[PDB]
Amino acid sequence: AGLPESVIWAVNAGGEAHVDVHGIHFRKDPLEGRVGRASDYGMKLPILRSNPEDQILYQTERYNEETFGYEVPIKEEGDYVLVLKFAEVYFAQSQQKVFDVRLNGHVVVKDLDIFDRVGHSTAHDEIIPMSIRKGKLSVQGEVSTFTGKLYIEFVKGYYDNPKVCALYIMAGTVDDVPKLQPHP
Amino acid sequence: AGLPESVIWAVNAGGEAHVDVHGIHFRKDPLEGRVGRASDYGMKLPILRSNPEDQILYQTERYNEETFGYEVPIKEEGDYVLVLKFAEVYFAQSQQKVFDVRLNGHVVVKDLDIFDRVGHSTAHDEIIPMSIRKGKLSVQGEVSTFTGKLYIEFVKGYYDNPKVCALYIMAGTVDDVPKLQPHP
């Protein structure tokens, strides 16, 4: 399967439906009114490094002052890649907003500091490959029992609030994923 | 670092987010509902000497009948410049509204009289260089211990109320700061 056919699940956090330049449909946020807080504060800002037709993905977010997450049903075994999209639309110094990302309890991004990596009002993506086979989840060399659902968590620490802007899961391997341009 | 990348902290007092013609993002006021009073009285007036796309910065203010201020975290040592933006949208004579500005207790502007300097409904900026090095703040030839936070105070005297319209801090020196056009 090619790119749009290979996407099994995708969300525009804090926002409405949007189809990007690759043909990927980011669905309206299923956690609206349910957990966390939506914000459209970034809609006043141009977002560097992303395509301008798609900057609405990075201008809307879901955030919270406590740990929160999304649950994802996965129907079939296979190889998959999770892509997480972020932007820092408020701070402009390091160690102001910092948080962990976990997958079924496994820490998969430690101490994410969006400003430190890319600057202010600029796109940043994390790309995480995984496998689901023989009743097991495998990610970053760690293995545990898979029950049918994936839990993606954004963890509250001491430095401001965890957040996410958009996310998708595709069948395949890392060479299949479109990459942001080098200029960060 | 060039101009937008060099701004570490910026506020539109009494107002919402706004990006100016130089690309500087003035954030929504963090003291809303907390300290002092917001006013949009100036939104009825054209502001002279400002770019017209940016006059909303000077049409909105925070003021108070007692002393008040902003606290600013500074993460790294270096040379910096503080820029303070003002307009007098009510009085049209001298010695009607007069106030001091202090930085960590140091008086850095004595007896500011906005009307006396520029007239009615006209932009006026103060430009204050400083250094943070070896555990110390240095400003206007005076030195004191720096703990990690800067306190910017607007002081109540006998002649009406202290106020501010917008403010920002950039890494660099005074030659790097955009200047208002010459005025009588």
- Half-sphere exposure at residue A45, Cβ-oriented, CA atoms within 13 angstroms: 27
Residues 6+ apart with CB under 8 A from B89: B41, B42, B45, B59, B61, B120, B121
Q: Which residues of B touch A (CB under 8 A)?
A: 4-5, 7-9, 16-19, 25, 27-28, 73-76
Q: Which of B90, B127, B116 lies closest to B184 in space, CA to CA? A: B116
* Residues B24, B54: Cα–Cα separation, whole Å: 11
Domain B3-176: give its CATH architecture. Answer: Sandwich (2.60)
Nearest-Cα distance to chain A for B75, in Å, is 7
CA distance A149 to A143: 15
Residue from the list B7, B19, B28 with its beta carbon closest to the beta carbon of A92: B7
- Give A3-174's CATH code, choosing from 1.10.3720.10, 2.60.120.310, 3.40.140.10, 2.60.120.430: 2.60.120.430
Breaks, C-N > 2.5 A, in chain A lie after none
Q: Which of A93, A158, A159 is most worth mutating to test chain B (most B CB atoms within 10 A of its CB)? A: A93
- Asked if B17 and A41 come within 8 Å (Cβ–Cβ), the reply is yes
Token readout for B29 is 């006021």
d(Cα A143, Cα A87) in Å, to the nearest integer? Answer: 30
Residues of B in contact with A119 (CB under 8 A): 5
B91 is in an annotated binding site: yes
* CA–CA–CA angle B140, B142, B147 (5° rounding): 110
Residue A29 tokens read as: 């946020």
Strand-strand pairing, A166-171 and A78-86: antiparallel
* Gap from A8 CA to chain B (nearest CA, Å): 37
Q: Break chain A into its structural domains and give their ranges.
A: 3-174
Cβ B76 vs Cβ B98: under 8 Å: no
Q: DSSP code of B68?
A: E
| Joined tokens for residue B72 | 């600013």
| Core vs surface per residue B86-97: b (16+ CB within 10 A) or e | bbbbbeeeeeeb
How far away is chain B from the Cα of A93, in angstroms, using its nearest Cα? 6
Q: By what method was this entry solved? A: X-ray
SS (H, E, C) chain A: CCHHHHEEEEEECCCCCEECCCCCEEEECCCCCCCCEEECHHHHCCCECCCHHHCHHHHCEEECCCCEEEEEECCCCEEEEEEEEECCCCCCCCCCCCEEEEECCEEEEEEECHHHHHCCCECEEEEEEEEEECCEEEECCEEEECCCEEEEEEECCCCCCCEECEEEEEECCHHHCCCCCCCC
Is-contact A85 A40, C-beta < 8 A? Answer: no
What's the distance, Cα to Cα, between the start and end of chain B in Å? 34
Using only C-alpha atoms, chain B has a radius of gyration, in whole angstroms, of: 16
